[PDB]
Design a protein around this ligand. Structure first.
Ligand code: K
Ligand code: MG
Ligand code: MG
Length: 84
RNA sequence: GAUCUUCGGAUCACUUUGGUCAAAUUGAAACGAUACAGAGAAGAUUAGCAUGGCCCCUGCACAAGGAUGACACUGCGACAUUGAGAGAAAAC
């Protein structure tokens, strides 16, 4: 019954190159291509952040709108705007 | 707010938001490699052009190529049974 707090103060930026020798970025399909297919179920890297309702939930600007949706990023816990 | 008007007001303008979709593991494709076989015509080597379509790829193309591009190329019962004999059964 208190305003919602922001979880991640920073913005996770995108910079990563798999398999340094044998990968090249693909402009059309925005993903790295070439190199070993690699296990389909291998990339899974444990998530870094985690959330619970108790310490995180609260009011936000979307509570006013009757048809508002939930944060894709609150559940995964990197909503970096808070109550805004 | 600007213009007049006579301090009543009149003019002038008047409803945005191109949305494969919210900051990239879990809704834009198609696969590397290793291991197996491993190149059409009845001996052997080998030119090709076709036929068929829920197979495509390269191409601007209704040219032409990709192993003659590849796969496929088979096969069965609107047979009426009587022709006869034998042992049985039921029957000339
Ligand atoms: K040939
Ligand atoms: Mg041809
Ligand atoms: Mg052919």
């Amino acid at each position: 019954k208190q305003p919602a707090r922001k979880q991640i103060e920073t913005r996770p930026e995108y910079e990563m190159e798999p398999e340094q020798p044998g990968q090249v970025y693909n402009l059309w399909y925005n993903k790295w291509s070439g190199g070993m297919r690699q296990d389909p179920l291998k990339s899974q890297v444990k998530s870094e952040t985690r959330c619970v309702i108790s310490r995180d939930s609260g009011y936000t600007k979307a509570d006013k709108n009757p048809g508002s949706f939930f944060c894709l990023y609150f559940a995964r816990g990197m909503c970096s705007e808070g109550s805004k």
